[model samples]
Target: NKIVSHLLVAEPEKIYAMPDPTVPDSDIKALTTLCDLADRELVVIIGWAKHIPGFSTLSLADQMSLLQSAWMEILILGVVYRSLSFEDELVYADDYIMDEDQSKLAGLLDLNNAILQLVKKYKSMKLEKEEFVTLKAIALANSDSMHIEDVEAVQKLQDVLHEALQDYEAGQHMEDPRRAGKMLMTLPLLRQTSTKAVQHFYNIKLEGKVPMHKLFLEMLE
Candidate 1:
């Protein structure tokens, strides 16, 4: 929770808060652009993961499996980070917004609440960029996907991230012994939130409300 809490400080601003009914196409364009940016970012993260020291040792299938399992959570974290910059509404990469009421009507009330609470919790902590990036890597590296062929190897990668985070904390917050523990405590929340994101995405897909990009669909499929 500590890591996530700190990371919430990185929020994106809403381009235009109010949705102009006359410019409906503008919202679509904005969403498209955001999805493109998000897809590229996801690619970059996966690319970085592939270059990790022990990552290549895994079978290609396992590598992909890990990416698939980790991508949604990473994406959600990315969106939340972006949303925390300005408003209570769940703002996408663009200004496409979904408030609590809309999410409830869409049958994503629980998922929306979970993410909102996470955003609020982390926002209160005021995390630095270093903590946010390291914590994100740690979360991604700790995937427990069923498709992972070599659990030990995956655990090894996680250990590397854990150590990296420890070193970061040692250098940055040595006085606060509880900081590391607090970050560790949020792992469960991360896992649960990712699961909820998957469920919510499927629901949204069925409704054809949000414009999910090709890359996003590729990861989920």
Candidate 2:
């Protein structure tokens, strides 16, 4: 039974059905769960940022703008970390799953492949939790966000995070001096992958495949 249980872990429950004009309740419930998870995570991110010494000092507008810019990337990172190890599906939480074939049909095959590559890279390095969260924070502190009032302030935070990550890599992964450099190199790809995910979701919305929650829809943009 225990061995069977382990095998069953590879079989994720089918949560999404073929799209129809009338959205099914199962699809609605699944999307609702994902929306709730993303919202809660966003709140946690905002709370964590505020506690950081310099983050709270940013003007309210800039704070909001930075979050808006970074949320999708962070969301994508979470998604990949959660599901990339699964055999051939995008596992959404414990109760929902979409297979690679279905994802391709939904026009997400390229985006999925991009994330898979990134996942492979991170896994190869045996990415640690501390390093993962630090990289996430660095992505959030991006200075290129449109309408950001204090670009220098955001860049300063990024600089602090980079140094913190470098210190971590030096002490924790002493054998791999290039670990930090490799992780940093993945940042641009992360941004690109997130953009593709957003675009895919946007097309899904246009086609009305399923009723998308407003919060999730906003993240698509």
Candidate 3:
């Protein structure tokens, strides 16, 4: 838990803000505003990464690649948690939300519905905040078998998170033996929505309606 333990300290206290009314309400504008706010989220996630124990020990290339691969997954993890409070909207960033009306035009209805469905499952299970942050770190720690040179280091990090999560599940849900596995099971769904998010954002960038951040583009590439 030495490494994974830092997550408690590294977690963001206030990750969202109330929407600014100046940003007009339209699908494209919302997407545009999201890209801008996503840049801020990217910064905060990267900040969280720097605070994690073994993350900074990886080579610069490894660091870049891991974030490149996992950034969307981690970002979506946060979004999923943030939206849990809302019954039907993707909290997006407090600045922009994609509701049923906005989602169809944004072409995000599928993504929105899917995320809400997952949140429903989360609500059913009463997912804990500890598990949520652990999942985020685990998502970022993955190398995706990208031929990372320090595979051992990355694996060690993953083990730390897995064990940490197991301990958490055991401590909290003593009666449910496979609870940790079930929580990890949600990763595939998380990854699917994450990929969808990447595709949709890329489309917006391709249309030139929104300019993606340089790092965001580099990661997408």
Q: Give the winner by lDDT.
A: 3
Error of 2 at 30 (Å): 6.2
List the candidates' TM-scores in order: 0.70, 0.72, 0.86
**Could you give me the TM-score of model 3 versus the true structure?**
0.86
C-alpha lDDT (0 to 100) for residue 168 of candidate 2: 75
Residue lDDT tens for model 1, 95-120 = 46678776655455787678877677
Sort by lDDT, best first: what order? 3, 2, 1
lDDT of 3 at 36: 64
Clashing residue pairs found in predicted model 3: none
Score each candidate by Cα lDDT.
Answer: 0.64, 0.65, 0.75
The alpha-carbon deviation from the true structure for residue 171 of candidate 1, after best TM-score superposition, in angstroms, is 1.4
**Per-residue lDDT of candidate 2, residues 23-113 (tens digit):** 5545454455555666566655565556544677877777777776787787777666666567656655545556666566545578777
Task: For candidate 3, write residues 1-221 as lDDT tens digits.
Answer: 44335677788766554555886667766666666666678777777787777777777667777787888888778888888878788877665567788888766788888788778788788887778888888888763846587887899889988888888788868989989898888888888888887787676664354443346435433
Error of 1 at 41 (Å): 4.8
Candidate closest to the true structure, highest TM-score: 3
lDDT of 3: 0.75
Q: How accurate is candidate 2 locally (lDDT)?
A: 0.65
The better-scoring model by lDDT among 1 and 2 is 2
Q: Give the runs in model 1 whose Cα sits over 4 Å from its true position.
A: 1-41, 51-53, 101-107, 203-221
